[PDB]
């Protein structure tokens, strides 16, 4: 019930948003920084409508969360029905069928034929924490291996596991220990197209410095998200999986950002036929509502004793109902193929921008998870400055585009799969205009 | 749909619930243990309705979450309107008024008159993690002081801060360090009704073993929930606050369980006119939806740099709508007063029961957070076995009572404030008959 149309009625942000921001600055901790202070009142399809009557094109999905669309009809109906029945029971006090059905679908849909079990929580960070807890409990080992460019969350442990100090970790430690980091595969920067070769180097550091028998878990994102939409070279994730099986360590795919159709497969692990021991999901899973999950090999998942896993809110009834509608909408609207169509278009348009603008060092990603890295032309020297100039101009023309990167020089595109063709095209036109302006 | 009456149509749990439990066992990880495997289909007022047609009296509130009632009408309305508008933007990308309004209301309603700021998250563990991040960033100190009988959550750091190893911590370490624990005030077991004297020993341990200028935060629940509804003697929390103010440490009140009307004041800190540096809230704040908060002195809250506090889902639009509804409901329906009236009924009935039955060692708590600790008669030796059996027998008669305690020997009562008087009475009648029945 909102027109799929870009609309700038005021300056961005407009007067009502600026008043709301003054309120924010008086009521809310400074640490909660706001990228684009336009205050949202409705959203759907490919549009965010703000308090001043503006409609902006959404190339963010709330950081890859509203993959099925903001207030997707099936989600709305399901949440509206669930909230009238009950809001919360604590599943561990008195359970409910929604939790159990979400677990069944996850067990069914994630990679591999083997027997699987699931546990539900609220946030990504919490699901990662729980993946580590499951692995230590099953293996009775201590060490967790993580990678360069990794991002896993804002709890103490998930901050330990995250690579970048500023601003995720700065001043918040000391950090949970027996966490060891080794290089990832980042071909633009490491010069190595062969993932098997890059994995050998990572695995040698694990063998020599950590000890294969001391490793509970090897934890990696299939595409490093906040780290710059960095995609390991083919062979890399596969060689980590084999090492884990061989040495009795639990291989954990962190699919918090890549899961649920985002990459042109239902899960990113599918791209290379990777079957992980555990898989962490969140963001896209419940179309906006707070839900996260750990799914994996039954025997590993069953490692922790009864009552050893939990949390008060986890697998909240409204969130499960929303997750079931998300799963149905993915199947019903074939959004996995829609993610592939969107990527074809974005890679084509961005490839053509890069062909004529050498400030784009690389275009990378798949499906609806695409990025450009901005550098000094012909080099790998980062240009964070240009990147902030580009985002600021793009926001000013009503396009919501996000930045990331270990070096602050990556522009990422996470459109919802409900984005209409004509708005995807217009958003890309705006991007071209901006690179022509700046 | 839902009649406010207890209804036992099948054995507890019935056949439909039993097939659902077998599905749970095939699909959900064994670690997510289930206390009472009746599968809920509807809830409201004082009642949980299960898949077999049973209606159970709810003395657990989902562990102190549905204080305003399950699916409270203002919540249902607020959530229904919000979901049709938007589900999520991530506040840190493009914000929305609901988050800011909730922060303003927390700033206004929490103890103290000074200027405050608030930040919003999803779970209690998350909020407590963030109180520690915030205290560490402002003070530039490392150490966090926690207490005996504490529970703060299931994340690595909140596991560290939690006292009891079994089953919260066992096998999940190693744990985030520079966490240091000292004794609390527990009059039934320590003999000391002077809270100020209990504090002196705790503070002397902080002084000598941590060092006052290394202490970033002192974190305590005003009533220890999971630990057995242990209520510190008067003057304990006051002495901690003062010591923190004098030594530059952040006093953090963890009111995740105790907040929002539960204890017969809006925040349990009010009972002793305690004004904490930071207060952590959750559970009852959003009437079932996942939301948590940290609120406190502006300077301290602004310690962390821009971009340092975050989380994709935090302050979710639906949850904020719910929270605004909860706050308005508490005010409109006078739920703080209502919590006092419930505490009065529960303290008198349970008191009478304790006068006749010396297996009850103590009745304790305030408002709708009341507990009985069970012991071998004439001693303080814990009786966990009796506590499990009384709880099981209550459940068999359709009363959802929960248990807790470091020694496993505490029966806790967390009725919703929407509990009709007649069902409060019948639940207590059920407890009395169960104590008479179970030897």
Automatic annotation (TrEMBL), chain A:
<dbReference type="GO" id="GO:0047589">
    <property type="term" value="F:5-aminovalerate transaminase activity"/>
</dbReference>
<keyword id="KW-0808">Transferase</keyword>
<comment type="pathway">
    <text>Amino-acid degradation; 4-aminobutanoate degradation.</text>
</comment>
<keyword id="KW-0663">Pyridoxal phosphate</keyword>
<keyword id="KW-0032">Aminotransferase</keyword>
<protein>
    <recommendedName>
        <fullName>4-aminobutyrate aminotransferase</fullName>
        <ecNumber>2.6.1.19</ecNumber>
        <ecNumber>2.6.1.22</ecNumber>
    </recommendedName>
</protein>
<dbReference type="Pfam" id="PF00202">
    <property type="entry name" value="Aminotran_3"/>
</dbReference>
<dbReference type="InterPro" id="IPR050103">
    <property type="entry name" value="Class-III_PLP-dep_AT"/>
</dbReference>
<dbReference type="GO" id="GO:0034386">
    <property type="term" value="F:4-aminobutyrate:2-oxoglutarate transaminase activity"/>
</dbReference>
<dbReference type="GO" id="GO:0047298">
    <property type="term" value="F:(S)-3-amino-2-methylpropionate transaminase activity"/>
</dbReference>
<dbReference type="InterPro" id="IPR004632">
    <property type="entry name" value="4NH2But_aminotransferase_bac"/>
</dbReference>
<dbReference type="InterPro" id="IPR015421">
    <property type="entry name" value="PyrdxlP-dep_Trfase_major"/>
</dbReference>
<dbReference type="GO" id="GO:0030170">
    <property type="term" value="F:pyridoxal phosphate binding"/>
</dbReference>
<dbReference type="InterPro" id="IPR049704">
    <property type="entry name" value="Aminotrans_3_PPA_site"/>
</dbReference>
<dbReference type="InterPro" id="IPR015422">
    <property type="entry name" value="PyrdxlP-dep_Trfase_small"/>
</dbReference>
<dbReference type="GO" id="GO:0009448">
    <property type="term" value="P:gamma-aminobutyric acid metabolic process"/>
</dbReference>
<dbReference type="InterPro" id="IPR005814">
    <property type="entry name" value="Aminotrans_3"/>
</dbReference>
<dbReference type="InterPro" id="IPR015424">
    <property type="entry name" value="PyrdxlP-dep_Trfase"/>
</dbReference>
<dbReference type="GO" id="GO:0042802">
    <property type="term" value="F:identical protein binding"/>
</dbReference>
<comment type="similarity">
    <text>Belongs to the class-III pyridoxal-phosphate-dependent aminotransferase family.</text>
</comment>
From TrEMBL, chain B:
<keyword id="KW-0032">Aminotransferase</keyword>
<dbReference type="InterPro" id="IPR015421">
    <property type="entry name" value="PyrdxlP-dep_Trfase_major"/>
</dbReference>
<dbReference type="Pfam" id="PF00202">
    <property type="entry name" value="Aminotran_3"/>
</dbReference>
<protein>
    <recommendedName>
        <fullName>4-aminobutyrate aminotransferase</fullName>
        <ecNumber>2.6.1.19</ecNumber>
        <ecNumber>2.6.1.22</ecNumber>
    </recommendedName>
</protein>
<dbReference type="GO" id="GO:0042802">
    <property type="term" value="F:identical protein binding"/>
</dbReference>
<dbReference type="GO" id="GO:0047589">
    <property type="term" value="F:5-aminovalerate transaminase activity"/>
</dbReference>
<dbReference type="GO" id="GO:0030170">
    <property type="term" value="F:pyridoxal phosphate binding"/>
</dbReference>
<keyword id="KW-0663">Pyridoxal phosphate</keyword>
<keyword id="KW-0808">Transferase</keyword>
<dbReference type="GO" id="GO:0009448">
    <property type="term" value="P:gamma-aminobutyric acid metabolic process"/>
</dbReference>
<dbReference type="InterPro" id="IPR015424">
    <property type="entry name" value="PyrdxlP-dep_Trfase"/>
</dbReference>
<dbReference type="InterPro" id="IPR049704">
    <property type="entry name" value="Aminotrans_3_PPA_site"/>
</dbReference>
<comment type="similarity">
    <text>Belongs to the class-III pyridoxal-phosphate-dependent aminotransferase family.</text>
</comment>
<dbReference type="InterPro" id="IPR050103">
    <property type="entry name" value="Class-III_PLP-dep_AT"/>
</dbReference>
<dbReference type="GO" id="GO:0047298">
    <property type="term" value="F:(S)-3-amino-2-methylpropionate transaminase activity"/>
</dbReference>
<dbReference type="InterPro" id="IPR004632">
    <property type="entry name" value="4NH2But_aminotransferase_bac"/>
</dbReference>
<dbReference type="GO" id="GO:0034386">
    <property type="term" value="F:4-aminobutyrate:2-oxoglutarate transaminase activity"/>
</dbReference>
<dbReference type="InterPro" id="IPR005814">
    <property type="entry name" value="Aminotrans_3"/>
</dbReference>
<comment type="pathway">
    <text>Amino-acid degradation; 4-aminobutanoate degradation.</text>
</comment>
<dbReference type="InterPro" id="IPR015422">
    <property type="entry name" value="PyrdxlP-dep_Trfase_small"/>
</dbReference>
């Amino acid at each position: 019930t909102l027109t799929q149309e870009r609309r700038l009625v005021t300056a961005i942000p407009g007067p009502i948003s600026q008043e709301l921001q003054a309120r924010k600055q008086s009521a809310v901790a400074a640490g909660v920084g706001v990228t684009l202070p336009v205050y949202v009142v409705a959203a759907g399809g490919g549009v965010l409508a703000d308090a001043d009557g503006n409609q902006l094109i959404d190339f963010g999905s709330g950081i890859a969360v509203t993959t099925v669309g903001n207030s997707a009809p099936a989600v709305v109906d399901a949440v509206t029905q669930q909230v009238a029945a009950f809001t919360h029971t604590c599943f561990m006090v008195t359970p409910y069928e929604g939790y159990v059905k979400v677990a069944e679908h996850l067990n069914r849909l994630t990679p591999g034929d083997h027997e699987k079990r699931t546990a539900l929580f609220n946030s990504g960070a919490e699901a990662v924490e729980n993946a580590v807890k499951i692995a230590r409990a099953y293996t009775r080992r201590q060490a967790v291996v993580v990678f360069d460019h990794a991002y896993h969350g804002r709890t103490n442990l998930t901050m330990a596991m995250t690579a970048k100090n500023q601003p995720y970790k700065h001043g918040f430690g000391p950090f949970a220990n027996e966490v060891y980091r080794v290089p990832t595969s980042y071909p633009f920067r490491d010069g190595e197209t062969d993932g098997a070769a890059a994995a050998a180097h990572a695995l040698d550091l694990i063998n020599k410095q950590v000890g294969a028998d001391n490793v509970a878990a090897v934890v990696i994102e299939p595409v490093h998200g906040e780290g710059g939409f960095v995609v390991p070279a083919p062979g890399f994730l596969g060689a980590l999986q084999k090492w884990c099986t061989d040495n009795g360590a639990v291989f954990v795919a962190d699919e918090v950002q890549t899961g649920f159709a985002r990459t042109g497969a239902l899960f990113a692990c599918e791209h290379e036929n990777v079957v992980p021991d555990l898989i962490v999901t969140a963001k896209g899973i419940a179309g906006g509502l707070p839900l996260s999950a750990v799914t994996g090999r039954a025997e590993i998942m069953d490692g922790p004793q009864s009552g050893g896993l939990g949390g008060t809110y986890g697998g909240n009834p409204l969130a499960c109902a929303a997750a079931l509608a998300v799963i149905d909408t993915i199947e019903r609207e074939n959004l996995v193929a829609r993610a592939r169509a969107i990527g074809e278009t974005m890679l084509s348009r961005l490839g053509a921008l890069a062909a004529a603008d050498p400030r784009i060092g690389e275009v990378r990603g798949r499906g609806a998870m695409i990025a450009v890295e901005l550098v000094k032309p012909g080099t790998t020297e980062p240009d964070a400055d240009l990147t902030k100039r580009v985002a600021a101009a793009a926001h000013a023309q009503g396009l919501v585009v996000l930045t990331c990167g270990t070096y602050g020089n990556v522009l990422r595109f996470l459109p919802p799969l409900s984005m209409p063709d004509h708005l995807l095209d217009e958003g890309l036109d705006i991007l071209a205009a901006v690179f022509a302006e700046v």
